[PDB]
DNA sequence: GACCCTCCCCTTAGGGGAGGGTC
DNA sequence: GACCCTCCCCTTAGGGGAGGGTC
Ligand SMILES: CC[n+]1c(-c2ccccc2)c2cc(N)ccc2c2ccc(N)cc21
């Protein structure tokens with residue numbers, strides 16, 4: 015009342031660090047009422063402690079410091095408004111994050127499936143859920159000459175909506191009795207969608223579509239140039255032996271086992287085709 | 291395939307800035323496959339573009355860069371785990387924020403009431419909702435000698451739970467036919483609670499309680515030392531004239547109209563008492 | 567002894583230059 | 590011409606010292 019608080023006093027009283035008070039002083043957000051012309055010691059009054067309330071609350075909600083300066087100068091009505099601003103900014107952060115919880119949750123579901131592989135290199139028939147995907151005409155591309163860059167445009171579309179880029183790389187081609195790799199060309203290349211958020215101004219050359227719900231003859235394995243083709247062969251054979259009727263392209267997905275530059279790269283390949 | 295991408299090429303392809311690639315290089319998160327010993331130009335392969343997926347997704351969810359380095363080295367199972375970590379960290383952020391939406395919403399409701407004052411300086415009788423509060427025995431304090439520092443301990447308790455410090459400052463005293471200020475002493479001083487989150491290890495000397503739901507004889511005004519007492523007088527008179535029966539202490543709240551150091555300080559005073 | 571002062575260095579993830587040199 | 594290089598300065602909100610000087 016009729017004396018001042020030293021810095022340490024204020025700091026214990028308002029639960030704000032000395033360093034912070036000192037800094038709040040440098041920026042002129044909150045200044046000691048008095049500074050001893052000799053010692054440079056900061057001294058504060060009791061009445062001024064109340065200006066800290068605003069500072070602490072705004073800090074708590076994450077208002078930048080230089081905004082608080084603008085905030086101090088408000089009568090209630092205008093400060094009421096100010097708060098609705100903070101509210102809608104918090105709702106955005108909420109929507110953003112809840113979207114994010116759902117996405118990761120899904121990314122996870124997809125990882126689990128690809129570690130619960132029944133076995134590698136043998137053919138399974140399984141019942142699959144729909145997978146939404148964006149795809150593009152693969153303009154004469156195939157296994158021997160497709161690049162990561164081929165996917166770039168698709169990826170830009172996905173990332174803009176989903177946020178989460180990392181995924182598998184897909185392509186499709188016709189089920190034929192192929193007798194070598196060079197014999198084969200992809201129909202479409204594609205990548206899966208994870209969200210249900212409208213894609214911004216998608217352009218004609220992309221197609222939003224799905225790998226439909228159905229029974230599927232599958233084969234999955236860890237990639238090796240040798241095994242690519244010979245595994246497809248198993249799949250062809252499997253189908254011929256059981257006289258199954260195929261009802262879609264061959265769908266091939268490729269997904270990195272890891273993303274380390276320090277280790278040898280390695281991929282999971284999965285090839286599936288729908289049967290009746 | 292049999293050549294490299296320059297930096298600008300990669301940047302267009304992965305939608306990552308040159309500055310970022312350059313930086314990701316400085317930290318060894320992602321390094322060009324080749325650097326021209328003469329020009330220092332960075333050159334990248336197609337195969338390596340895939341390491342960016344992880345980088346971009348993790349960046350999207352806000353993993354610090356130095357964590358991504360640890361993240362790259364994971365097989366799927368361990369990376370699955372990693373993701374559940376990210377999930378629970380997102381839930382915390384969600385709980386935090388949703389708490390925050392509710393708090394501000396309330397802070398707002400309270401501001402509206404104190405701008406919908408029916409009029410200042412005249413007495414109203416109104417029906418009030420409960421207000422939860424923490425209070426402490428005011429050890430002989432009163433109007434003439436209470437400080438902001440008096441509230442400090444209460445405030446520490448509130449802030450630890452609510453996050454939001456800024457509020458009104460309350461006190462209570464006995465309804466007597468006072469004939470001067472020095473005649474009066476506060477019973478308890480208090481501050482309102484905003485959350486319903488358990489207060490951490492509150493200590494006996496605090497009381498969690500409320501200003502109960504009821505009818506109340508009120509008077510509110512903008513503070514002036516003169517008007518403090520004379521307004522109380524109106525309230526006493528009001529009650530005597532209508533022979534009302536009082537059923538609680540006088541509750542006094544004080545709230546800053548603004549938090550500017552640059553303007554003259556100014557307070558709203560509200561004095562209310564419960565009647566049957 | 568305890569408290570306070572200034573000044574200097576640190577962390578994040580780059581963006582915006584300037585002034586080279588290179589495709 | 591357009592692209593790329595290095596190096597230097599910038600923003601946030603302080604925390605952790607060191608080496609004074611002061612309660
Ligand atoms: C789908 C083709 N394909 C092959 C491949 C398949 C058969 C023969 C030769 C290469 C490949 C081979 C190596 N080593 C490394 C990466 C990839 C790859 C990477 C992405 C992608 N979308 C397709 C990819």
Ligand SMILES: CC[n+]1c(-c2ccccc2)c2cc(N)ccc2c2ccc(N)cc21
Pocket residue numbers: 061433434436437438459460515518544
């Ligand atoms: C409730 C008392 N009171 C009075 C006051 C009331 C009557 C006579 C003299 C001072 C006050 C007067 C001025 N100028 C500035 C701040 C305050 C204040 C601030 C906080 C608080 N909790 C109580 C406060």
